[PDB]
JSON list of C-alpha atoms in Angstrom, two decimals:
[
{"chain": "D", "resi": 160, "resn": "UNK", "atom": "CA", "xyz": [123.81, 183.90, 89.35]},
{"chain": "D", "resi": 161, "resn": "UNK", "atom": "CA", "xyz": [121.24, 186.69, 91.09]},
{"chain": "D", "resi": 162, "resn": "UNK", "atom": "CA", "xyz": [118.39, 186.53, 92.95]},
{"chain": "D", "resi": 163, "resn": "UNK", "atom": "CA", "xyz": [115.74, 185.24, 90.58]},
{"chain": "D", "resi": 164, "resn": "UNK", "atom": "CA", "xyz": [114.79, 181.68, 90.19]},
{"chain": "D", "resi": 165, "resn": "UNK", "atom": "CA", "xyz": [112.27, 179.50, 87.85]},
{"chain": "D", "resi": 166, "resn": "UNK", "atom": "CA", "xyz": [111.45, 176.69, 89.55]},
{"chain": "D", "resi": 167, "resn": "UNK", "atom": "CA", "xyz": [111.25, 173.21, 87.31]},
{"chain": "D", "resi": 168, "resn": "UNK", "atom": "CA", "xyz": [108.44, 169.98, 87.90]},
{"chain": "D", "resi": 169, "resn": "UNK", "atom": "CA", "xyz": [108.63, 166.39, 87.26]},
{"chain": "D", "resi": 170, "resn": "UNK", "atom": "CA", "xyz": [107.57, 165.77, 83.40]},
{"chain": "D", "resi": 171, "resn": "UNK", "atom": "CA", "xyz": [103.74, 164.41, 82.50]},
{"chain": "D", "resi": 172, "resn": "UNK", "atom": "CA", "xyz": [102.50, 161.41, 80.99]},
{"chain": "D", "resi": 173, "resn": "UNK", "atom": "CA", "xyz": [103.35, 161.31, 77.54]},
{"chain": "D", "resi": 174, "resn": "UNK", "atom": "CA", "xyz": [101.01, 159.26, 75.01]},
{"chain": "D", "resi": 175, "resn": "UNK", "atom": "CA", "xyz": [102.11, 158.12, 72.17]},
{"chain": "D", "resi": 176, "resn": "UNK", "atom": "CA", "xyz": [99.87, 156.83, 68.95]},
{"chain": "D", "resi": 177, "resn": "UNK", "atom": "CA", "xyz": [102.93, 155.30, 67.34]},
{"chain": "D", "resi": 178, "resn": "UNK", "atom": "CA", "xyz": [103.73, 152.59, 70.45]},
{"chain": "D", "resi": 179, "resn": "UNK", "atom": "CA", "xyz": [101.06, 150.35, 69.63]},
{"chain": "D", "resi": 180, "resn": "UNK", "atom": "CA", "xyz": [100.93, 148.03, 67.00]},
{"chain": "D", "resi": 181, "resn": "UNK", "atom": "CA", "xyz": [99.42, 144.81, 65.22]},
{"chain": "D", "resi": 182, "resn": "UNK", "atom": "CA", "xyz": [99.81, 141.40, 65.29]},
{"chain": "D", "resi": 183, "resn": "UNK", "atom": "CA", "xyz": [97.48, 138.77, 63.14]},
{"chain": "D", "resi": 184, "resn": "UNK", "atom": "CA", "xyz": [94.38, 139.72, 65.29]},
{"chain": "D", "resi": 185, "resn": "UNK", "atom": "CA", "xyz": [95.49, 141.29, 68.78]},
{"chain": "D", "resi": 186, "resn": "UNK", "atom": "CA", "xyz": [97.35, 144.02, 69.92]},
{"chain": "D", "resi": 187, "resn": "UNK", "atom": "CA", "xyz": [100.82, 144.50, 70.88]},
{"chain": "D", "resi": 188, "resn": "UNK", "atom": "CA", "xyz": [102.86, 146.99, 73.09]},
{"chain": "D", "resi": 189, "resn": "UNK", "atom": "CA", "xyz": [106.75, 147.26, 72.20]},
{"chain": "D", "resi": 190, "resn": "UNK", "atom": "CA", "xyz": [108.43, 149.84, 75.00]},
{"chain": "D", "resi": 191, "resn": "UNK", "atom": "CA", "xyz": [111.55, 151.42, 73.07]},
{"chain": "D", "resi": 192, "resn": "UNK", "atom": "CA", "xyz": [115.10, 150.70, 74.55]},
{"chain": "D", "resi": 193, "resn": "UNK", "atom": "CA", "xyz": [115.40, 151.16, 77.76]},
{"chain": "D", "resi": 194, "resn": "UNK", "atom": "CA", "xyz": [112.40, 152.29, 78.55]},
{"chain": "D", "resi": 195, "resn": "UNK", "atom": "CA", "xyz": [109.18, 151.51, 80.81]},
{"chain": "D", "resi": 196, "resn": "UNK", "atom": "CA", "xyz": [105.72, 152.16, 79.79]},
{"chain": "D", "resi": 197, "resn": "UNK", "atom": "CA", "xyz": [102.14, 152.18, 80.97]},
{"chain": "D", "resi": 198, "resn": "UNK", "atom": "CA", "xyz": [98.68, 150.91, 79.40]},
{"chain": "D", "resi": 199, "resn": "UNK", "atom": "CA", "xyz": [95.23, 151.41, 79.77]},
{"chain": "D", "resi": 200, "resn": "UNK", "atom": "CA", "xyz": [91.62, 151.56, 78.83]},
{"chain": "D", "resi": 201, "resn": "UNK", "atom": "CA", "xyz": [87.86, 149.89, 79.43]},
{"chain": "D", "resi": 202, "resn": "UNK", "atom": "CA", "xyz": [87.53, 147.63, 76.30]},
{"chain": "D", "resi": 203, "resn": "UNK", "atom": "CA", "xyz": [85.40, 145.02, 78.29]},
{"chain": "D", "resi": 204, "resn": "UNK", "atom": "CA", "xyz": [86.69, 145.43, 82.09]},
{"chain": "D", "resi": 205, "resn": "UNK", "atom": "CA", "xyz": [89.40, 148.18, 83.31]},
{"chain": "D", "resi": 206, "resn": "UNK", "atom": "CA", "xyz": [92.62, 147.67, 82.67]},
{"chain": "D", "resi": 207, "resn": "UNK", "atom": "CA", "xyz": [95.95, 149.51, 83.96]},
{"chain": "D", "resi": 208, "resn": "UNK", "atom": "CA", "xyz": [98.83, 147.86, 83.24]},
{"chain": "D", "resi": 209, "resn": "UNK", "atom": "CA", "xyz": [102.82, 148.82, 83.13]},
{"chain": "D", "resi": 210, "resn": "UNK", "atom": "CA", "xyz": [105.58, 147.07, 81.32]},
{"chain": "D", "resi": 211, "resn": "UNK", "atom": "CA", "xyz": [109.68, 147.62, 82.16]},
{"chain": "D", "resi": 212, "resn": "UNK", "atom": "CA", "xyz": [111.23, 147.06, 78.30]},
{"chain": "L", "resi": 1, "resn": "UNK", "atom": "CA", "xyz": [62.27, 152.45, 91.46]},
{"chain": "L", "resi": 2, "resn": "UNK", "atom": "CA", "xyz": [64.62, 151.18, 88.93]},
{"chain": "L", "resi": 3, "resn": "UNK", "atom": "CA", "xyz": [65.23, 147.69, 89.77]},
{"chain": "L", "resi": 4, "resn": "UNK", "atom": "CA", "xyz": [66.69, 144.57, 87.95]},
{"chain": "L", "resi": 5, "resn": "UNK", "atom": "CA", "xyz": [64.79, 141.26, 87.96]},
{"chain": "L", "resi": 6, "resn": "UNK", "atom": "CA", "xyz": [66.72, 138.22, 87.45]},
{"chain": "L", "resi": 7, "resn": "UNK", "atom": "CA", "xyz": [65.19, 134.94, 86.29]},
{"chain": "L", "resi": 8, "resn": "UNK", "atom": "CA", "xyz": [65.53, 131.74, 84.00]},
{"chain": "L", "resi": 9, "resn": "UNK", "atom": "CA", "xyz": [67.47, 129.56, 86.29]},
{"chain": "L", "resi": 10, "resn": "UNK", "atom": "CA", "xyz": [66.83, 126.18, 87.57]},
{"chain": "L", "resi": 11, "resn": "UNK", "atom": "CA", "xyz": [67.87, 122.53, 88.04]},
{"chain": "L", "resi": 12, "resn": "UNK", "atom": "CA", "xyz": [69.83, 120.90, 84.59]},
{"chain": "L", "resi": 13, "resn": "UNK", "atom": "CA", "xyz": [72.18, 117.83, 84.17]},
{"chain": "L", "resi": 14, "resn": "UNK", "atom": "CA", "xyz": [75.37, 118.63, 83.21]},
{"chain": "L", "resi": 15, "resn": "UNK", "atom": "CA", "xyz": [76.57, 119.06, 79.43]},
{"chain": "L", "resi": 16, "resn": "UNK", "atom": "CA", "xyz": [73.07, 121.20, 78.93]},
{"chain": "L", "resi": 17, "resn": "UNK", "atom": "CA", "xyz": [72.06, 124.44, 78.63]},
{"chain": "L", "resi": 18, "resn": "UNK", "atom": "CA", "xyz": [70.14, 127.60, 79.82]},
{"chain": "L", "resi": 19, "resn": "UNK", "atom": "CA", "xyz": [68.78, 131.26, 79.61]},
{"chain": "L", "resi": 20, "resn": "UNK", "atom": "CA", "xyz": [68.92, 133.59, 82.18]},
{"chain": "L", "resi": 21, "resn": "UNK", "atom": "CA", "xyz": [66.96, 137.03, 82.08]},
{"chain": "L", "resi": 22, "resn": "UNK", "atom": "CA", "xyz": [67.80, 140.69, 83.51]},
{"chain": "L", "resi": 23, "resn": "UNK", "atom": "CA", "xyz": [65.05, 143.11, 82.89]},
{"chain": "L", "resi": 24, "resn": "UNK", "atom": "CA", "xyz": [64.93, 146.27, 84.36]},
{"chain": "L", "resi": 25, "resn": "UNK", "atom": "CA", "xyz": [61.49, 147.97, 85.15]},
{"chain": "L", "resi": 26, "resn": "UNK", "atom": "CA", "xyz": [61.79, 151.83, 85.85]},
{"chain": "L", "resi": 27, "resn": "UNK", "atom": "CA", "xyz": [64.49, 152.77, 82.83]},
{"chain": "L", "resi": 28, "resn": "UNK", "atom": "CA", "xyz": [65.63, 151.06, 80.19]},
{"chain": "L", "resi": 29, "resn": "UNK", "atom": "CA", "xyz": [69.46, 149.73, 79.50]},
{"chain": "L", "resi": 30, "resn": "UNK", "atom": "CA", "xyz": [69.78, 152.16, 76.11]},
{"chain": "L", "resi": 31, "resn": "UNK", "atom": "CA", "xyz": [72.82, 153.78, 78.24]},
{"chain": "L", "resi": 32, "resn": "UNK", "atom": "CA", "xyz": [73.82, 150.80, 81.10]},
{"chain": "L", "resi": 33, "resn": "UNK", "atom": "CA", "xyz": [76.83, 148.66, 80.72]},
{"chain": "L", "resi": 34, "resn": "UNK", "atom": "CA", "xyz": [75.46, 145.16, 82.02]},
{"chain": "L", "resi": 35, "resn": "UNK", "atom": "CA", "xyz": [77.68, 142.94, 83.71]},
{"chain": "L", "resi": 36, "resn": "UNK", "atom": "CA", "xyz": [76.55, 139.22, 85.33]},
{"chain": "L", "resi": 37, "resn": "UNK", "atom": "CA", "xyz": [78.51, 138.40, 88.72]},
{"chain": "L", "resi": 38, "resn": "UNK", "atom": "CA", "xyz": [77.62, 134.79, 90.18]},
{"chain": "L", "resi": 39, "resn": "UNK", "atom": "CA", "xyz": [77.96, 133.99, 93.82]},
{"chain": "L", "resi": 40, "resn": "UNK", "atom": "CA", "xyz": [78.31, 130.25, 95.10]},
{"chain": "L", "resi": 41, "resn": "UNK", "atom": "CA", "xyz": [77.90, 129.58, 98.12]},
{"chain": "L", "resi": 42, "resn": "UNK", "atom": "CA", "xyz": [81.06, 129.04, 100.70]},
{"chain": "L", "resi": 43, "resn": "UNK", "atom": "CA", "xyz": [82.98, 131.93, 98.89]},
{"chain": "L", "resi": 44, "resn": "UNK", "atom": "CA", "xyz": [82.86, 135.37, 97.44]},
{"chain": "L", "resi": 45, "resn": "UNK", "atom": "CA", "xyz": [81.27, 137.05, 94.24]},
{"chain": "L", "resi": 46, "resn": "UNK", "atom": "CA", "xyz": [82.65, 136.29, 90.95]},
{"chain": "L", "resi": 47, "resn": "UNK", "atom": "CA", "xyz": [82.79, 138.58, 87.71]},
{"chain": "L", "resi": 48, "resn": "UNK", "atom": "CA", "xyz": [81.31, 136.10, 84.78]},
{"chain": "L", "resi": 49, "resn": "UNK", "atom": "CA", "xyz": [81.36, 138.11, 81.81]},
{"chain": "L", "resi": 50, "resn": "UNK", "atom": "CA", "xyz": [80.10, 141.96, 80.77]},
{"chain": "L", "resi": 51, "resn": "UNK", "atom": "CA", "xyz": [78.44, 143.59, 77.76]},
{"chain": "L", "resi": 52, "resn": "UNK", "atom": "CA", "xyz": [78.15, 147.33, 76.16]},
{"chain": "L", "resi": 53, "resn": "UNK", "atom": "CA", "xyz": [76.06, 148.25, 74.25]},
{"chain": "L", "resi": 54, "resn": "UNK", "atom": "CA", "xyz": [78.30, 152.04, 73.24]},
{"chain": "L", "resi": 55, "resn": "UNK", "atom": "CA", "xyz": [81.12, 149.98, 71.34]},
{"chain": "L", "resi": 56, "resn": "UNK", "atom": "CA", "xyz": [79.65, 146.81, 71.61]},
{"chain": "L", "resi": 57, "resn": "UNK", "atom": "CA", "xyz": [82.22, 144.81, 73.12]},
{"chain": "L", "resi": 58, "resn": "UNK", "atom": "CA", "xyz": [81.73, 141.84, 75.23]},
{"chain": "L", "resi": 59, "resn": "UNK", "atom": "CA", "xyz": [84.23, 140.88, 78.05]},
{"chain": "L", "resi": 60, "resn": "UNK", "atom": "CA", "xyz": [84.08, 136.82, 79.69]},
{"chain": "L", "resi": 61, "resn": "UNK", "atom": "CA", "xyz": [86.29, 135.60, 82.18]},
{"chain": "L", "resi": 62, "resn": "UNK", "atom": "CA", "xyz": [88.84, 132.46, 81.85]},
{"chain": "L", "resi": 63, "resn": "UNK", "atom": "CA", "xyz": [85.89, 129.77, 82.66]},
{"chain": "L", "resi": 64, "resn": "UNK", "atom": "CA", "xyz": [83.57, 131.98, 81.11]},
{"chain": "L", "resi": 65, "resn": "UNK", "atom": "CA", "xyz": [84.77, 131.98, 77.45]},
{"chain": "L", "resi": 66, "resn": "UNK", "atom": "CA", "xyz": [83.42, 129.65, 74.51]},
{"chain": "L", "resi": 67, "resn": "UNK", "atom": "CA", "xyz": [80.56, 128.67, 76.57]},
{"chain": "L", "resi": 68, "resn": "UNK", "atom": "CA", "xyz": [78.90, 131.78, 77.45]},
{"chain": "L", "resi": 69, "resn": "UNK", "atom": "CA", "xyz": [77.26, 134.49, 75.16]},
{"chain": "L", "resi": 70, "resn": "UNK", "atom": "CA", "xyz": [75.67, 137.53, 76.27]},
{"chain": "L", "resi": 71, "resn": "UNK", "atom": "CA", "xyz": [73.20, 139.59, 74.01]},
{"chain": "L", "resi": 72, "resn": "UNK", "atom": "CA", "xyz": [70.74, 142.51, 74.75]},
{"chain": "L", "resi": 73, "resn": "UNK", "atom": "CA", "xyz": [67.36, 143.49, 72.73]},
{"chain": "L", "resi": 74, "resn": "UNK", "atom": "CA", "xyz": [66.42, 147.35, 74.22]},
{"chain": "L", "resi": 75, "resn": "UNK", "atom": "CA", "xyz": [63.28, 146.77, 72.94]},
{"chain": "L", "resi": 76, "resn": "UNK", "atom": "CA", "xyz": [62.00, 145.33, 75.53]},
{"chain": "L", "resi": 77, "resn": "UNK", "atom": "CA", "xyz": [64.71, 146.29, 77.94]},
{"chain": "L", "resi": 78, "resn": "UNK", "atom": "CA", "xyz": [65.90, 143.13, 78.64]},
{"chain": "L", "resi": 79, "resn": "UNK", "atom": "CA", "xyz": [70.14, 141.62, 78.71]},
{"chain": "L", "resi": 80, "resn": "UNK", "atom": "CA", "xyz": [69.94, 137.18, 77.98]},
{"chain": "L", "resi": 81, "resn": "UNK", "atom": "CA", "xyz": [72.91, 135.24, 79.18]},
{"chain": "L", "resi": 82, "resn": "UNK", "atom": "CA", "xyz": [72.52, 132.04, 76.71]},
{"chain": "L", "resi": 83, "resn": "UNK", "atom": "CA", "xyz": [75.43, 129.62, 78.19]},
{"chain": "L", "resi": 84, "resn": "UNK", "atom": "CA", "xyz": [75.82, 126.10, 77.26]},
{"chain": "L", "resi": 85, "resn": "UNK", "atom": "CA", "xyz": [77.97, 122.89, 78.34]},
{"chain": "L", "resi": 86, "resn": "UNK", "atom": "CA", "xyz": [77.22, 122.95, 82.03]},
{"chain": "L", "resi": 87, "resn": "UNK", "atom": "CA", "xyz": [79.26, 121.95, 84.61]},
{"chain": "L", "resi": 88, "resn": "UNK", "atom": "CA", "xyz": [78.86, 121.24, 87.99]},
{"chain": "L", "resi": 89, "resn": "UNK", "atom": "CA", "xyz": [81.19, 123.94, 89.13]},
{"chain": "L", "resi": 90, "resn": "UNK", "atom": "CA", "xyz": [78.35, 126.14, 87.76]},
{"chain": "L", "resi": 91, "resn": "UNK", "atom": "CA", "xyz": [75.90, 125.67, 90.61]},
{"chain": "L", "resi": 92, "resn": "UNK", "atom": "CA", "xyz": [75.21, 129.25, 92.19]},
{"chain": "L", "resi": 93, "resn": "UNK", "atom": "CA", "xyz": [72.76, 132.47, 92.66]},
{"chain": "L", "resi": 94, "resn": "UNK", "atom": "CA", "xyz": [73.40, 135.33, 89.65]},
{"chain": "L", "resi": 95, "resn": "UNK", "atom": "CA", "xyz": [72.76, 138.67, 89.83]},
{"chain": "L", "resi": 96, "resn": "UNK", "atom": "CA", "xyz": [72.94, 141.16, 86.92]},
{"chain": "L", "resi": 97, "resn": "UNK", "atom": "CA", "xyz": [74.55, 144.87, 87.37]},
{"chain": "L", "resi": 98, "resn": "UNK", "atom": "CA", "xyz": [73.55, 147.75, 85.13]},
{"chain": "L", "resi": 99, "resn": "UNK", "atom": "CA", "xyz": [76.23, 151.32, 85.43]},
{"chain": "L", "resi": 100, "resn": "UNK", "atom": "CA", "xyz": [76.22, 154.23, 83.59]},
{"chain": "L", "resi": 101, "resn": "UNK", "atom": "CA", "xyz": [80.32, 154.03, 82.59]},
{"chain": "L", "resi": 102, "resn": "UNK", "atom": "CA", "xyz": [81.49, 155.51, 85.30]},
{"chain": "L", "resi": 103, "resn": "UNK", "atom": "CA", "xyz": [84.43, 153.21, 84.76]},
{"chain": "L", "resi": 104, "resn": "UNK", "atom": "CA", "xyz": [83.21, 150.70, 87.24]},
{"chain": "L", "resi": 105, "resn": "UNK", "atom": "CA", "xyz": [84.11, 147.17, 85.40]},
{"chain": "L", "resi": 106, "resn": "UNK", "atom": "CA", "xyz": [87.66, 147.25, 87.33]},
{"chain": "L", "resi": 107, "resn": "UNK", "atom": "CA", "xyz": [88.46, 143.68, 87.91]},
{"chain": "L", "resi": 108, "resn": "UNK", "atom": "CA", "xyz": [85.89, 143.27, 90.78]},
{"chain": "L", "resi": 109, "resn": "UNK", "atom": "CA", "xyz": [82.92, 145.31, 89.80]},
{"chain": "L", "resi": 110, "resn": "UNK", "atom": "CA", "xyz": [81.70, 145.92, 93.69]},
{"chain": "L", "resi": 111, "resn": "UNK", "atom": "CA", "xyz": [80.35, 148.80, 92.54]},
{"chain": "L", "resi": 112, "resn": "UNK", "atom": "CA", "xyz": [76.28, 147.80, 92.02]},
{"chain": "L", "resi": 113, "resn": "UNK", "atom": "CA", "xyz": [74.99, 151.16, 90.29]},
{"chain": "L", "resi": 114, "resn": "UNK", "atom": "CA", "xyz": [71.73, 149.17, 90.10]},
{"chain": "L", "resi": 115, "resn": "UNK", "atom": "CA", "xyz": [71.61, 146.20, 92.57]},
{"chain": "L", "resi": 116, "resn": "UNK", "atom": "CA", "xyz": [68.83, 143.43, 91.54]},
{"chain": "L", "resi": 117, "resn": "UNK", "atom": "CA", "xyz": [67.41, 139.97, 93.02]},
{"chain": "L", "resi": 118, "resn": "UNK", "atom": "CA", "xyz": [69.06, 137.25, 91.60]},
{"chain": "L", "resi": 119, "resn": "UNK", "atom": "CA", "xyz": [68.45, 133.77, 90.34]},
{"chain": "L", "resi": 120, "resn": "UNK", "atom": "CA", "xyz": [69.43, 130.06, 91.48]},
{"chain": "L", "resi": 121, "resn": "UNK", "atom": "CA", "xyz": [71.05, 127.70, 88.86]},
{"chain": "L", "resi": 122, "resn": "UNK", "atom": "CA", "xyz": [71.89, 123.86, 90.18]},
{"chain": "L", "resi": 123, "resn": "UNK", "atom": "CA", "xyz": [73.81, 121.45, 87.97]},
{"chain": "L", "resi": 124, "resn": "UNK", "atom": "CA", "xyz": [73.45, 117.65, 88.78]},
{"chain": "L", "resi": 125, "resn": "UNK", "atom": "CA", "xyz": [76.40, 115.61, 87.61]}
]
C-alpha cells in the first residue's frame, strides 16, 4: 500500500441483443438466473418496465 | 397558427358507427405522431388509441381494441378515427394531439405539442 489511489464507480446499463426472444407472434423477456432486468421502448405508447427473474 | 380541427361527431344509437376527423391547417402531419384522448364528462382525460406514421405502428387501449381503427392520408393532411359497435360508455368530447416524438406517448400523454378543439359524440341506448 502507498499513497496513490484509483477510485472505482457503480457499473452501467448493460444491453443485451441476445435477452429477447420469440414466441408464436409476441415477444418475450427471459432474465438469466438470478438476475433482474429492465425494458423499454415507444412501439405505440412509452414503456419502462423491470422484471426480478 | 398550426391548429387541429376536430369534427365528425354526433348523436348515434348504440351498436353503430362513426368517423371522426383531425386536420391540421398551418403544417402538415408528414412528421407528427397523432394520438386521440376522449374526455367525458364527471372525470378526467382518457388515452384512446395513437398512430405513427415513422414505423407505422398503431397503439389502442383495453376498450379501445377490435373496435377502433385509426388511419392517416398526408395528402390532405388529415388522421380518421373509423370506430364501430358503439356503446353508451362512449358518450364524450375528443380531441386529437399531434408531437414531434419527443417521446411524449408515456401512459398519459398530457403533453399537447399541438392542442386542438374537439368534437362531441352521444350514444343513445
Amino acid at each position: 500500500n502507498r499513497g496513490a489511489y484509483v477510485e472505482m464507480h457503480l457499473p452501467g446499463s448493460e444491453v443485451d441483443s441476445s435477452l429477447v426472444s420469440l414466441s408464436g407472434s409476441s415477444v418475450t423477456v427471459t432474465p438469466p438466473d438470478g438476475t433482474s432486468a429492465l425494458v423499454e421502448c415507444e412501439c405505440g405508447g412509452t414503456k419502462i418496465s423491470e422484471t426480478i427473474n | 397558427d398550426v391548429q387541429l380541427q376536430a369534427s365528425g361527431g354526433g348523436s348515434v344509437q348504440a351498436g353503430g358507427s362513426l368517423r371522426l376527423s383531425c386536420a391540421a391547417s398551418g403544417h402538415s402531419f408528414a412528421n407528427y405522431h397523432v394520438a386521440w384522448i376522449r374526455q367525458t364528462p364527471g372525470k378526467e382525460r382518457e388515452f384512446v388509441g395513437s398512430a405513427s406514421r415513422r414505423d407505422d405502428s398503431t397503439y389502442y387501449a383495453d376498450f379501445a381494441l377490435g373496435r377502433f381503427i385509426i388511419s392517416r392520408d398526408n395528402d390532405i393532411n388529415t388522421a380518421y378515427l373509423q370506430m364501430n359497435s358503439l356503446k353508451p360508455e362512449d358518450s364524450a368530447v375528443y380531441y386529437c394531439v399531434a408531437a414531434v416524438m419527443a417521446q411524449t406517448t408515456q401512459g398519459w400523454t398530457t403533453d399537447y405539442d399541438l392542442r386542438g378543439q374537439g368534437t362531441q359524440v352521444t350514444v343513445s341506448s
